Amino acid sequence: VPPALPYDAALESKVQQRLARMTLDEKVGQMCQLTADPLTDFTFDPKAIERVVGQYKVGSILNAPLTTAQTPEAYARFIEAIQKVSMKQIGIPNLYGLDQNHGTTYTLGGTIFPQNINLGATFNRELTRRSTEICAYETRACLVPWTFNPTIDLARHAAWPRFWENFGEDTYVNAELGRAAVLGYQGDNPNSIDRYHIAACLKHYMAYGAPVSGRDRTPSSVSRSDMREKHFEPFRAAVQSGVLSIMVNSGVDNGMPFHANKQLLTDWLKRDLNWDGMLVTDWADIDNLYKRDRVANNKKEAIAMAINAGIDMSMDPYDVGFTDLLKQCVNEGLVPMSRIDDAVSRILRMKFRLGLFDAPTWNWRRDYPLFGSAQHADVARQSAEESMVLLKNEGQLLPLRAGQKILLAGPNANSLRALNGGWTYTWQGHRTDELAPQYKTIYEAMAERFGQDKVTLSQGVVYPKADEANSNWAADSMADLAATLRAAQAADVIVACVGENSYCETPGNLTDLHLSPNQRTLVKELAKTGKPIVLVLSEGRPRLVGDIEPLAQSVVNIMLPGNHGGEALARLLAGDANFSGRLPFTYPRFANALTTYDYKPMESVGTMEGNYNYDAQVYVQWPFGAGVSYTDFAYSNLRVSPAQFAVSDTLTVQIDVQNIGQRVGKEAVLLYSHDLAASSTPDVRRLRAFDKIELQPGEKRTVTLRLPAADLAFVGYDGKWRLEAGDFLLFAGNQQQRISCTATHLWTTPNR
């Protein structure tokens, strides 16, 4: 297959000319990545930089100094010092990386976007691209040319604490928005990423979000068809768009740590996809091979196993001794020089693509005036608005009106930490209200929009301040419930903001998906006042709320909309904006009946032979794609041509969508398929395409979607792709159309 990134002879000549000049010490140093802590005396230590970079030849540094967000100036002066030693002693520029994963996670003042789960709910490729383009600009303003993003793990277990870091439970959404994210970060030329753009990094390759138990970094048990058809597909898709780097899943599947899995790292990914990018470990995961999983007896053997499996750079991330042990591997014949040379070739190639040899630093004081601008914040607020899902709205309770006295209650009502979640200024997000109080909480934005005299704050339940480890992220407590109920009696409408406080990775593991008991009791007691309730779900995971949903006339899921989510929510609740978000996952009802939308027919209740109207409503609080608007949209006249088709065809799908209500609004248009009979029992529905359009009242538009016939193929039992003769249904809104594949096509190549 053609190279994932275009062949460039001049680029390869620079790579090989530099490789030919390097000592073994310099080669192993390029493969070593350390965090900023070994360089920290925020004050850095010049002697530490000379040692780590000058003596040990370390080629990459990552992370926020002091593990907390810093200003662009603080990063710039630090990286200037790093680059001075790197160019003088090595002649190869350092590669600095940050986990800038919803805007500038680790840069104070930068534009903070909704988390990726929210962007999934926007179904909006261009808005996703615009956000990572803004993130790229604001990260280069720190002299940083690389983000470890996008995360495109499939969200396959609602208990997993990293549920909210990806674009949701669906393969196609993660593939398409992952591509849009890569394009926004990197721009349109992977071989020349200018100084407004940064290297992207897909993570965490792969199946990281399917742990059997839901606990982070515990084994998955992914089926043969699922591994290729679903978990691999977003990585394959975004590799095809030219991503410069990929980070490997820390965990384990079928007893095999991914960091030791040569078949998946080298064969499926680098070789099959002909991808010449740079493959980095996740944090300390070479250490994990011997300490955690005991597939190696010591660190030397762990390094050899990971590097031979295809790893190019180790996020060690603390010990310069990695370089000594890798040299021992080479000297003892455990790793061949061909593998070292190839790894360094990939690292150098990435550095050349970022322009770092010619510009290891650049004019950060002058060239980034839009950093943290209101113009950038407008895009974040739009993203936030388009992500919020109106799940229920009985009796036109929303939008709220002038005059109405509003009570804001719940532990998520007056907190920026709650709006942002984890990966915000600190890893756990546990200091956001302390570090960036200038941004607007839900309460502050509601008070500004509706008037201080109309908006009263009485939480009833509060979160404590996090300890340093954020060990108390799940804690909350009742706080003068009596006063809160009195305040509810005095109001016209209650906006109750419940869900989760912030957490990240394993510290956020949970043991029961239910919403916390105090927050359940709060909403039940508010309901007894007889006042109408707008239930706002503010959370990284879809915590169970089936016992309080019947009490709420309206329900809004804001997930984790970031610094501008309060502003956005106030505009939606006021009717300045119109809801258009749609759930990018299944919201479960019960702790031990978890399902996704793309389930098998045998899991349906009641479906009769020859029907395809499957029913999971007794198990699903709200389904994938749920969401309503303040206006109404009618779909009609679904057309598909050619209706008889084979693998070489492209299907042209057209659906008419009319705003039949009184408000302008956007509508995400989602196209599903179902294979009516198959040699592997067929998923009841699969999302195959989507678009999003804005319609004036009364306006009708034809939406056209192009669907290659091969997108109706599936991975059969033998692990190979096949498109089978037989019928399918395509679905758009409540419209459906039957089509027929006239001839079976079996692939012999690993990918279609």
In the complex, the residues that contact Na ion under the rule CB under 5 A are: 437
Task: Give one DSSP letter per residue of 283-349, joined into a string.
Answer: TTHHHHHHHTS-SSSSHHHHHHHHHHHT--BEE--S-THHHHHHHHHHHTTSS-HHHHHHHHHHHHH
Q: Residue 251: name its binding partner from a copy of itself, Mg ion, Na ion, none (Cβ under 5 to 8 Å by kind).
A: a copy of itself
Q: Shortest distance, CB of residue 678 to a copy of itself, whole angstroms?
A: 7
The sign of the CA dihedral 431, 437, 441, 444 is: positive
Q: Up-side HSE of residue 26: CA atoms within 13 Å toward CB?
A: 16
Task: Kindly tell me which of 530 and 610 has the beta carbon lying closer to a copy of itself.
Answer: 610
Task: Kindly tell me which of 219 and 540 has the beta carbon lying closer to a copy of itself.
Answer: 219
The residues near 555 (Cβ < 8 Å, ≥ 6 apart) are 390, 391, 392, 393, 534, 535, 536, 537, 549
Query: For residues 229 and 176, what is the distance between their CA atoms, to the nearest angstrom?
Result: 15
Task: Kindly tell me which of 321 and 437 has the beta carbon lying closer to Na ion.
Answer: 437
Q: Shortest distance, CB of residue 589 to a copy of itself, whole angstroms?
A: 8
**Residue 196 vs residues 114, 141, 271, 357: alpha-carbon distances, Å:** 21, 8, 31, 16
Task: Kindly tell me which of 30 and 250 has the beta carbon lying closer to a copy of itself.
Answer: 250
Task: Tell me if 230 sits within 8 A of 171, measured CB to CB.
Answer: yes
The residues near 120 (Cβ < 8 Å, ≥ 6 apart) are 166, 167, 168, 170, 173, 174, 177, 584, 585
Interface residue with Mg ion, options 474, 678, 693, 729 (CB under 5 A): 678
Q: Residue 717: name its binding partner from Na ion, Mg ion, a copy of itself, none (Cβ under 5 to 8 Å by kind).
A: a copy of itself
Q: Shortest distance, CB of residue 724 to a copy of itself, whole angstroms?
A: 11
How many Cβ atoms are within 10 Å of 678's Cβ, its own excluded? 15
Q: Shortest distance, CB of residue 717 to a copy of itself, whole angstroms?
A: 5
Helix axes 233-240, 171-186, angle to 10 degrees: 30
Task: Kindly tell me which of 313 and 536 has the beta carbon lying closer to Na ion.
Answer: 536
H/E segment holding residue 381: helix 374-387
- Locate 286 and state its tokens: 């070479």
Task: Kindly tell me which of 436 and 723 has the beta carbon lying closer to Mg ion.
Answer: 723
State the Cα angle at 124 between 119 and 129, rounded to 5°.
80
Q: Shortest distance, CB of residue 158 to a copy of itself, whole angstroms?
A: 8
* 683 touching Mg ion, by CB under 5 A: no
Q: Shortest distance, CB of residue 679 to Mg ion, whole angstroms?
A: 8
Q: Residue 724: name its binding partner from Na ion, a copy of itself, Mg ion, none (Cβ under 5 to 8 Å by kind).
A: Mg ion
Of the listed pieces 182-190, 227-235, 542-550, 722-730, which binds Mg ion according to CB under 5 A?
722-730
Task: Tell me if 167 sits within 8 A of 173, measured CB to CB.
Answer: yes
Q: Which of the residues 262 through 321 are near Mg ion (CB under 5 A)?
A: none
Query: For residues 342 and 254, what is the distance between their CA atoms, to the nearest angstrom?
Result: 28
Q: Shortest distance, CB of residue 64 to a copy of itself, whole angstroms?
A: 27
Nearest-CB residue for Mg ion: 726
Task: Kindly tell me which of 225 and 736 has the beta carbon lying closer to a copy of itself.
Answer: 225
How many Cβ atoms are within 10 Å of 593's Cβ, its own excluded? 11
CA 177 to chain centroid, in Å, comes to: 9
Q: Residue 584: name its binding partner from a copy of itself, Mg ion, Na ion, none (Cβ under 5 to 8 Å by kind).
A: none
Amino acid in position 427:
W
Q: Which of the residues 648 through 677 are near Mg ion (CB under 5 A)?
A: 675, 677
Q: Up-side HSE of residue 450: CA atoms within 13 Å toward CB?
A: 31
Amino acid in position 560:
L
- Locate 131 and state its tokens: 């956000």
Per-residue binding letters, 724-743, with Mg ion (x by CB under 5 A): x-x-----------------
Q: Residue 256: name its binding partner from Na ion, a copy of itself, Mg ion, none (Cβ under 5 to 8 Å by kind).
A: a copy of itself
Query: For residues 449 and 348, what is the distance between their CA atoms, to the nearest angstrom?
Result: 52
Amino acid in position 186:
Q
Task: Kindly tell me which of 352 and 612 has the beta carbon lying closer to a copy of itself.
Answer: 612
Q: Shortest distance, CB of residue 443 to Na ion, whole angstroms?
A: 9
Q: Residue 308: name its binding partner from Mg ion, a copy of itself, Na ion, none (Cβ under 5 to 8 Å by kind).
A: none
**Site size with Mg ion, rule: CB under 5 A:** 5
Q: Residue 437: name its binding partner from Na ion, a copy of itself, Mg ion, none (Cβ under 5 to 8 Å by kind).
A: Na ion
| Interface ranges with a copy of itself (CB under 8 A) | 159, 213-215, 217-219, 221-226, 251-257, 261, 288, 290-297, 510-513, 589-595, 600-603, 609, 619, 676-682, 716-717
Reduced to 3 states, what is the DSSP secondary structure of residue 278?
Answer: strand
Which of the following is catalytic: 8, 153, 282, 312?
Answer: 282
Nearest-CB residue for Na ion: 437
Q: Shortest distance, CB of residue 441 to Na ion, whole angstroms?
A: 6
Q: Residue 16: name its binding partner from Na ion, Mg ion, a copy of itself, none (Cβ under 5 to 8 Å by kind).
A: none
Q: Assess whether 342 carries a catalytic annotation.
A: no
Task: Kindly tell me which of 284 and 660 has the beta carbon lying closer to a copy of itself.
Answer: 284
What is the distance between the terminal CA atoms of the chain, rounded to a whole angstrom? 11
Catalytic (active-site) positions = 282
Binding site for Mg ion (CB under 5 A): 675, 677-678, 724, 726
